[PDB]
Amino acid sequence: TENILRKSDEEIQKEITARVKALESMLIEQGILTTSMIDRMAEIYENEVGPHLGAKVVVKAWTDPEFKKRLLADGTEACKELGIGGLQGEDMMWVENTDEVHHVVVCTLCSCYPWPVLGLPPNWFKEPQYRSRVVREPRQLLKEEFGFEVPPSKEIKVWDSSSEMRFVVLPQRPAGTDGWSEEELATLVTRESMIGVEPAKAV
Amino acid sequence: MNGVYDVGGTDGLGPINRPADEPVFRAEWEKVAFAMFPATFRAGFMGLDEFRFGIEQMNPAEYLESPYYWHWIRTYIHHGVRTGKIDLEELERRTQYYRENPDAPLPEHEQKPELIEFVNQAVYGGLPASREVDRPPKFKEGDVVRFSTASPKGHARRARYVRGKTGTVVKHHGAYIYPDTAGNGLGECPEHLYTVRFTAQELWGPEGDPNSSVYYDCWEPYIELVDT
Ligand SMILES: OB(O)c1ccccc1
Numbered sequence: 215t216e217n218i219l220r221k222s223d224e225e226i227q228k229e230i231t232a233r234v235k236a237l238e239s240m241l242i243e244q245g246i247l248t249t250s251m252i253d254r255m256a257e258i259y260e261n262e263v264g265p266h267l268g269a270k271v272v273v274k275a276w277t278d279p280e281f282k283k284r285l286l287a288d289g290t291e292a293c294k295e296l297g298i299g300g301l302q303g304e305d306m307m308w309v310e311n312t313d314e315v316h317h318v319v320v321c322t323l324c325s326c327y328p329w330p331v332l333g334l335p336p337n338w339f340k341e342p343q344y345r346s347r348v349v350r351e352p353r354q355l356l357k358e359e360f361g362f363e364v365p366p367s368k369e370i371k372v373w374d375s376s377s378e379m380r381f382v383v384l385p386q387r388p389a390g391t392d393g394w395s396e397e398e399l400a401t402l403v404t405r406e407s408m409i410g411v412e413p414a415k416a417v
Numbered sequence: 418m419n420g421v422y423d424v425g426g427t428d429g430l431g432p433i434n435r436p437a438d439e440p441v442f443r444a445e446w447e448k449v450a451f452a453m454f455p456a457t458f459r460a461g462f463m464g465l466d467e468f469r470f471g472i473e474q475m476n477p478a479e480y481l482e483s484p485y486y487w488h489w490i491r492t493y494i495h496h497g498v499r500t501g502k503i504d505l506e507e508l509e510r511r512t513q514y515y516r517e518n519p520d521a522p523l524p525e526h527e528q529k530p531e532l533i534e535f536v537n538q539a540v541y542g543g544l545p546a547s548r549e550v551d552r553p554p555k556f557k558e559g560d561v562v563r564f565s566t567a568s569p570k571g572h573a574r575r576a577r578y579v580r581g582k583t584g585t586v587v588k589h590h591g592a593y594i595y596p597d598t599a600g601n602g603l604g605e606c607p608e609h610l611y612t613v614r615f616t617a618q619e620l621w622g623p624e625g626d627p628n629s630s631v632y633y634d635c636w637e638p639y640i641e642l643v644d645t
């Protein structure tokens with residue numbers, strides 16, 4: 215949105231880059247930050263931890279009613295059955311979309327997000343536009359931003375992550391997928407479907 | 418505090434910017450900012466609640482429009498100064514140096530296996546905030562409660578849009594680190610934690626979506642009984 219007071223993106227990037235490099239140099243001299251530490255954190259969240267993990271959990275719940283029960287009872291413990299868990303997912307609570315209820319998750323106070331199953335959040339999730347509006351006009355937001363029309367008679371539950379509890383949406387299994395393999399089902403599961411801003415992929 | 422970061426319910430912030438796709442890290446400085454989190458945590462700059470409070474104290478205009486990981490940089494510097502671990506004058510001098518010499522090297526340093534071990538343990542083991550306390554939970558599922566109208570200047574998880582509002586306890590989660598102490602350097606002082614359901618009409622008035630509710634987590638001191 216236009217702000218006549220704001221510097222160019224290039225100038226902003228130039229200034230941030232110098233400030234970060236300066237701070238980095240100081241933390242390096244303190245002995246608390248190293249290049250290998252930086253590279254390891256980046257590697258994990260670029261290549262190891264991402265929404266494909268959440269997708270594995272969803273399709274197991276879709277194809278295993280007992281596991282689904284355990285998942286909804288204690289998300290952290292159920293996900294550990296698949297070797298999934300850890301930082302910013304220490305306390306996970308999964309919530310089930312149905313014909314009667316639709317769930318969507320937000321962190322209005324910051325950016326909180328279940329890293330072990332979704333990886334790091336996309337920037338829009340962390341930004342003020344989504345955060346401000348989804349608790350106030352979720353039906354209109356889903357329609358206008360995501361092309362997702364939730365009928366007015368259907369309840370929308372918005373989960374604001376004000377604590378270390380991390381809410382994750384278990385999307386409804388799309389019609390026309392009877393007997394599909396877990397691998398085939400996983401192709402329908404998106405990051406967005408586990409935030410609640412889109413359903414799982416149709417067809 | 419009643420900072421602008423507390424954006425739930427604010428109108429006029431604009432349309433969502435959502436590119437069709439995006440990388441996890443948009444620039445190398447973002448990788449550095451991200452990795453500084455376990456680094457400064459291990460070094461005792463701050464815990465998680467304090468980390469959040471540093472961001473909450475940003476210049477509001479800067480907060481609203483800066484790249485996300487710039488928020489993290491601000492809170493590192495904030496706590497570095499608070500703890501005396503970062504000299505601001507030296508940081509400013511080094512900033513100017515790297516402005517003028519962007520490709521100048523970083524300081525020579527040794528790699529440390531213990532920092533990789535720390536990263537791996539934190540990532541895959543987590544940093545659980547759950548705690549055992551001696552007191553039983555005061556509230557239970559189905560209790561009708563009212564959220565506090567307190568307005569502390571220090572850190573808390575008291576979004577303005579739920580203050581003074583009436584809701585129903587949905588779940589008791591056990592006890593957890595309490596932000597109102599931890600974020601202000603006053604320690605964990607754990608409290609029982611509850612998810613509470615607020616209707617959209619309760620939050621936004623008679624106009625509200627009659628078929629929507631917001632679920633919001635409340636530490637025990639945040640809420641008091643209306644009806645059991
Ligand atoms: O928005 B968050 O709850 C958050 C958690 C960990 C690090 C940084 C931010």
Ligand SMILES: [Co+2]
Pocket residue numbers: 321323324325326327
């Ligand atoms: Co957050």
